[PDB]
């Protein structure tokens with residue numbers, strides 16, 4: 097429950113680490129919401145698992 | 150395997166940049182994938198763009 | 203036409219990738235405009251070529 | 256020694272992510288420390304969490 | 309006397325480089341002030357030495 | 362050559378930090394340049410400052 101400034105490429109780095117061997121997808125049009133949330137608010141590593149392949 | 154892991158972190162940041170709005174699916178997985186090509190030799194931004202959506 | 207949060211050192215990383223073997227220059231006083239633009243608005247990779255050596 | 260130095264830069268970013276509000280003390284120092292473990296083999300986020308506060 | 313957008317993990321990367329072999333600590337609750345200052349204002353590398361071990 | 366490429370990405374981020382308002386010209390090019398010195402051995406922030414404007 098602290099903002100982590102997961103803005104821009106930081107979110108892709110976070111997904112890279114969270115998702116491991118599965119990989120992930122990064123689709124700006126479909127992920128406008130989580131992009132904003134992780135940058136200016138808080139988003140959990142558990143929530144980010146939703147973007148693993 | 151650590152060097153490949155670290156190389157992948159740089160790759161996903163580069164894809165974030167070059168793919169822009171299109172985004173990308175990251176599959177280190179992929180047969181003949183981006184890690185095989187671009188952690189073995191330097192990929193230009195034109196070569197990295199092949200992996201975008 | 204999507205902001206990429208190319209703030210702070212991200213802009214230097216972008217120039218590094220765009221400019222390749224030419225290298226680039228980063229001069230905060232002279233580049234106040236593009237620094238602001240790439241961070242809070244949109245700036246193209248083609249525009250960034252203006253700061254390659 | 257440069258590879259270990261660069262690996263450490265990635266480690267501290269990963270710890271920033273996984274440790275969240277708890278934070279961490281970074282001691283490359285430490286006997287049986289994080290660089291010995293995680294620059295030799297890939298550490299998952301669960302292994303990295305062992306180094307958090 | 310120019311802001312360097314040392315936000316989020318950038319501050320931990322800065323501490324990593326500044327502190328060298330000493331290492332550093334990153335404690336969000338205790339360091340709310342310098343976290344804000346380095347992200348939205350200016351903070352010197354000399355000031356950051358206060359968070360080396 | 363990939364390791365040198367990745368090392369360079371870290372170097373330009375470190376120069377962004379240490380050079381501050383002065384900025385820098387990045388020439389991987391340069392005879393006896395920063396990649397030869399600092400991707401072979403670890404450069405402190407004082408050694409990196411030699412490459413600033």
Ligand SMILES: Oc1cccc(O)c1
Nearest residue numbers: 159160163187191192
């Ligand atoms: O920009 C990059 C990053 C990582 C590997 C590579 O070949 C190119």
Ligand SMILES: Oc1cccc(O)c1
Nearest residue numbers: 265266269293297298
């Ligand atoms: O996420 C990371 C970063 C660096 C080394 C490692 O094993 C894992």
Ligand SMILES: Oc1cccc(O)c1
Nearest residue numbers: 371372375399403404
């Ligand atoms: O801070 C750095 C980054 C890359 C190489 C080096 O010697 C030092």
Ligand SMILES: [Cl-]
Nearest residue numbers: 155261367368
């Ligand atoms: Cl690296």
Ligand SMILES: [Zn+2]
Nearest residue numbers: 162268317374
């Ligand atoms: Zn980074």
Ligand SMILES: [Zn+2]
Nearest residue numbers: 103207209315
């Ligand atoms: Zn930022």
Ligand SMILES: [Zn+2]
Nearest residue numbers: 103106212318
């Ligand atoms: Zn950033």
Ligand SMILES: [Zn+2]
Nearest residue numbers: 155261367371
């Ligand atoms: Zn690296």
